[PDB]
């Protein structure tokens, strides 16, 4: 669960 | 034959459902006391 959390959060680091 | 047949046997043994026995929600202490107190009820001394 936490790895899914960090994956989705880190995926949007692009800007 | 060695593994899957034994898996079938083990699954059928483990997931077996007791026949009848009503619903037993009202009774509280009958896990092992059933047969003990029942034999106590139906106890007859040996006669010579």
């Amino acid at each position: 669960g936490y790895m899914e959390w960090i994956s989705k959060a880190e995926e949007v680091i692009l800007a | 034959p060695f593994f899957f047949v034994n898996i079938f046997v083990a699954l059928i043994i483990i997931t077996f459902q007791e026949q009848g026995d009503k619903m037993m929600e009202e009774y509280s202490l009958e896990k092992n006391e059933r047969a003990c107190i029942d034999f106590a009820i139906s106890a007859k001394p040996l006669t010579r």
Binding site: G1, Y2, M3, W5, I6, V12, I13 | -
Partner: protein
């Protein structure tokens, strides 16, 4: 008497005409007092029975003794709250119903030492702290997210960026996101009249960072006065007690892992860079979880994304319907 009925009618029509006007400002209380049981209120039966740890919203002006306020409760009607001097007077009245309040004890000593009340028996003394009954707080409660561990590190950073992106995207057009790069834990109100008022004094406090932190305080206030919900992206506060005695009084959101065993491997998953600070990163978690949960306002103790997502969505939803 006709005068009391006339002022009752005047207050009623003023309340009716003020039902649809913007809120002026808000107050913070620290005493459990009920404003409905006091007979000195201009309107009886329309008081407020509010306990401690509660927020009140003031819209219009009545007098120096009472004010028109509203509760943060959903469905709470317009009521009247005491003025701070009125609360001081009622606090003085609270301790006068007892047999004695000053120095002369009543242990079978009547008629021997009259002991007229000196300045010690009034509110003039006990001024070492003298916490006012009212505190100034932002109109809309700010939201602060606490790191499961030290902020500024990868794992926590994604932990709060997920929430930040969610609040931005779902709740666009009614929520403003602000980042406080500088410190925010140095918010004090009873230190001095004006420490470092000017930058040309060349004082130790004038050239220090407290000036910018003090200036950071009121911008939260102006953003709150716009009715728009605002969050604080402070990278220094990692414990609720660090930002609890200040005048911000924010909403604190707790994102935590259930067990440190999961946290250690979650930190491990980032790479070799976090291995160096992993050691100090355990204590920021364990000291924080040792904190009692009553200090925290909301708790996110689950690991799925969407359930916590809707949890915080509904929490700020109930906060939205509270003040509308």
């Amino acid at each position: 008497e006709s005068a009391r009925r006339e002022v009752e009618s005047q207050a009623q029509q003023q309340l009716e005409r003020a039902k649809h006007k913007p809120v002026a400002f808000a107050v913070r209380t620290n005493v459990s007092y009920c404003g409905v049981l006091d007979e000195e209120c201009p309107v009886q039966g329309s008081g407020v029975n509010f306990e401690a740890k509660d927020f009140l919203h003031i819209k219009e002006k009545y007098s120096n003794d009472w004010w028109i306020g509203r509760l943060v409760k959903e469905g709470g009607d317009i009521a009247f709250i005491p003025s701070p001097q009125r609360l001081e007077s009622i606090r003085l009245k609270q301790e006068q119903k007892a047999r004695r309040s000053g120095n002369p004890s009543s242990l079978s000593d009547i008629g021997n030492r009259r002991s007229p009340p000196p300045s010690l028996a009034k509110q003039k003394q006990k001024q070492a702290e003298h916490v006012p009954p009212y505190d100034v707080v932002p109109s809309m409660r700010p939201v602060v997210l606490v790191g499961p561990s030290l902020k500024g590190y990868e794992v926590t950073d994604m932990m709060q960026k997920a929430l930040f992106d969610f609040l931005k995207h779902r709740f666009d057009g009614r929520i403003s996101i602000t980042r406080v790069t500088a410190d925010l834990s140095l918010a004090k109100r009873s230190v001095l009249n004006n420490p470092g008022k000017r930058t040309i004094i060349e004082r130790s406090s004038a050239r220090s960072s407290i000036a910018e932190v003090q200036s950071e305080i009121e911008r939260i206030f102006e953003l709150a006065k716009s009715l728009q919900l605002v969050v604080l992206d402070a990278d220094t506060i990692n414990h609720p007690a660090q930002l609890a005695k200040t005048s911000l009084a924010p909403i604190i959101v707790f994102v935590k892992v259930s067990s440190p065993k999961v946290l250690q491997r979650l930190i491990r998953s980032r790479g070799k860079s976090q291995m160096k600070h992993l050691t100090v990163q355990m204590m920021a978690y364990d000291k924080l979880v040792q904190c009692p949960p009553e200090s925290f306002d909301v708790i996110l103790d689950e690991n799925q994304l969407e359930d916590a997502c809707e949890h915080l969505a509904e929490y700020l939803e109930v906060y939205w319907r509270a003040t509308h």
